[PDB]
Amino acid sequence: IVGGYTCEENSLPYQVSLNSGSHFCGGSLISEQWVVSAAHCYKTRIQVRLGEHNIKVLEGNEQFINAAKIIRHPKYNRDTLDNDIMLIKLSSPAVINARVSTISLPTTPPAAGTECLISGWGNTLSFGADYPDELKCLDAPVLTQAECKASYPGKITNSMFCVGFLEGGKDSCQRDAGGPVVCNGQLQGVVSWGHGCAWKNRPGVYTKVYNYVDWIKDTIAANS
Ligand SMILES: [Ca+2]
Ligand SMILES: [Cl-]
């Protein structure tokens, strides 16, 4: 996250870190045993780290759980990042407490101008790299489809939307992908991609969670 602030420790209890030796992506806990993330974050083996604040120091509330089953969206395209969404089933259900909790599915797509909360352990710079110790947070509004499409002509599919600031300076960035965009207490977006981080007229592009409500519910029911 570029231009954000350090979240208050454990104040985003649904935020998880995806690990394979080091942090590489985010995800969102939507049920005791299930995480939502991005299809392009997929690895053969992933460890889910919950209850994290400083991801480089054990502090006392962490839960580490290895993923049992990973399901990319069947229509995911590695080149265009269409349908960039994925489900991870934990090998054991997470213990639910003040520090590790779930975030809800949306009931409608978020309207342009809705204030949202993006978060992750991604790069904090527009140039070069600084990966933070502690979880970063950004308040950012949903942008219109027209603004989105104008910022990335020809690249915005029906699965994607933009959130951020066209003036630049505040954005998601590398290794934030797969993490949450939460608006009015529902998971509306999955961090996916952009050109640069926090460049003028180059807002982050996120996967529309609402488009996959049926697929999420049915896949999870069918694999429980
Ligand atoms: Ca930690
Ligand atoms: Cl692309």
Curated annotation (Swiss-Prot):
On pH dependence, the entry says: Optimum pH is 8.5.
For the biological process aspect of GO, one term held by this record is: antimicrobial humoral response
Sorted alphabetically, the keyword list is: Calcium, Digestion, Disulfide bond, Hydrolase, Metal-binding, Protease, Secreted, Serine protease, Signal, Sulfation, Zymogen
EC code(s) of this entry: 3.4.21.4
Name used for this protein in its record: Trypsin-3
| Keyword Cell cycle in record | no
As stated in the Swiss-Prot or TrEMBL entry, residues carrying the post-translational modification Sulfotyrosine are 131
Q: What is its main location?
A: secreted
Write down the top EC class of this protein. hydrolase
Its GO CC terms? Answer: extracellular region; extracellular space; tertiary granule lumen
Record entry for activity regulation:
Not inhibited by Kunitz-type trypsin inhibitors.
Q: How is the cofactor bound?
A: Binds 1 Ca(2+) ion per subunit.
Catalytic residues of the enzyme: 40, 84, 177
Q: In which tissues is it expressed?
A: Detected in pancreas and pancreatic fluid (at protein level). Expressed in pancreas and brain. Detected in ileum.
Which cofactor is essential here? Answer: Ca(2+)
* Underlying gene: PRSS3
Its annotated compartments are: Secreted
Family assignment?
A: Belongs to the peptidase S1 family.
- Per the UniProt record, the site (Required for specificity) maps to 171
Q: Which residues bind Ca(2+)?
A: 52, 54, 57, 59, 62
Q: Which GO terms describe its molecular function?
A: calcium ion binding; serine-type endopeptidase activity; serine-type peptidase activity
